[PDB]
Design a protein around this ligand. Structure first.
Ligand SMILES: NC(=O)c1ccc[n+]([C@@H]2O[C@H](COP(=O)([O-])OP(=O)(O)OC[C@H]3O[C@@H](n4cnc5c(N)ncnc54)[C@H](OP(=O)(O)O)[C@@H]3O)[C@@H](O)[C@H]2O)c1
Length: 293
């Protein structure tokens, strides 16, 4: 069946449907709406779609119902199994998409997962990019994300106006999976920079240092410090970036390391620390709460 017009003209071939309105996906999709690309959203929990519906965005009943109405599906759900559900479940994207639709997975998983998604989608005539991001919740909100992309370079170029609505530095990394590859390098760094900050703070507190001055001196400076030290000092342990998601990222890091015969003892330790945090019931706190939960 064909369908009625929506927010974005069909002849643009740039109608976007966005799946996963979380800490990242809400602000990202809002930036796409402000830029005139957002036609539709889907979220597993319907309440989060409310602010979109109040701006006229179509609220889909399933990923399939979203896919049949758009040219580009952006996915920003938690983990690779969640991407599998939204793409390939009973009412997943593949049940609604027409050939030539592009899926862009902006969530974090792995090169191997990116390649599997692309392979499976190509059987339906659906294109794929892996385009994970860095910059945190604050970057999402500000529209300044760094976006690292794998897949056909021609599709990277075609979608650059969409990426520029959400981010600032848009980097083409190579074939399918090279965006996830970059993102997993990035997550090694983020994890250990976060452990750095937390251990520094634990030592500073034990020594009874003036936190104002600690923050001044450390702002040693890193991403984690700039994004999360103010929250941490106020005891705001909310994400931010959930500990369970970093655990997940570090699992893929260590799988890739093992596949390639590289030893990453720091990443192994980080994985252990974040694994304990999830076991202890703090998986939904931000990563900056490590050591403090
Ligand atoms: N937060 C950060 O700083 C940050 C930065 C860069 C990249 N990332 C990555 O971006 C991705 C999203 O992160 P986030 O911080 O936005 O996570 P989040 O706040 O936990 O949101 C997760 C989103 O995924 C949806 N979801 C999860 N499982 C699903 C399933 N099986 N089916 C359908 N929807 C599902 C959730 O739906 P509900 O609303 O129903 O729960 C929610 O919309 C993750 O891969 C994360 O690692 C995060």
């Amino acid at each position: 069946h064909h369908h009625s017009s929506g927010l974005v003209p069909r002849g643009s071939h740039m109608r976007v449907g966005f799946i996963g309105l979380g800490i990242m996906g809400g602000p990202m999709a809002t930036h796409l709406l402000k830029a005139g690309f957002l036609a539709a959203v889907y979220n597993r929990t319907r309440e989060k779609t409310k602010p979109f519906a109040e701006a006229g965005v179509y609220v889909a009943e399933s990923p399939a119902d979203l896919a049949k109405r758009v040219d580009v599906v952006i996915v920003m759900v938690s983990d690779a199994p969640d991407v599998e559900q939204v793409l390939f479940g009973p009412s997943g994207v593949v049940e609604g998409a027409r050939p030539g639709l592009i899926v862009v997975d902006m969530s974090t998983n792995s090169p191997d997962w990116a390649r599997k998604f692309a392979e499976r989608l190509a059987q339906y005539g659906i294109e794929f990019l892996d385009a994970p991001v860095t910059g945190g919740q604050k970057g999402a909100i500000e529209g300044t994300l760094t976006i690292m992309v794998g897949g056909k370079e021609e599709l990277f170029h075609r979608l650059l106006p969409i990426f520029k609505a959400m981010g600032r530095d848009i980097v083409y990394m190579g074939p399918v999976g090279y965006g996830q590859a970059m993102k997993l390098v990035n997550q090694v760094v983020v994890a250990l920079n976060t452990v750095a900050m937390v251990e520094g703070l634990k030592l500073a507190k034990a020594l009874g240092l003036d936190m104002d001055k600690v923050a001044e001196v450390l702002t040693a400076r890193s991403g984690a410090i700039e994004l999360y030290l103010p929250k941490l000092l106020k005891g705001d342990l909310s994400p931010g970036f959930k500990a369970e998601h970093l655990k997940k990222d570090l699992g893929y890091v260590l799988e890739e390391a093992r596949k390639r015969g590289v030893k990453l003892p720091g990443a192994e330790l980080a994985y252990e620390l974040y694994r304990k945090m999830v076991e202890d019931g703090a998986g939904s706190l931000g990563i900056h709460a490590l050591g403090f939960y």
